[PDB]
Amino acid sequence: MTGLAEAIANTVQAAQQHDSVKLGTSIVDIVANGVGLLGKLFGF
Structure with a gap:
């Protein structure tokens, strides 16, 4: 799934x-x- x-990164934009x-x-x-x-899959 994506x-x-x-979902969590959908609020971090303003919440951070x-x-x-x-x-x-x-x-x-989650963040x-x-x-x-x-982090291990991509790098971050």
């Missing part, structure tokens, strides 16, 4: 991992944690 990180730090469990552990899965 909605594993896209900010508002999520105060509200969101499947968002704060910093979940990203660890793609």
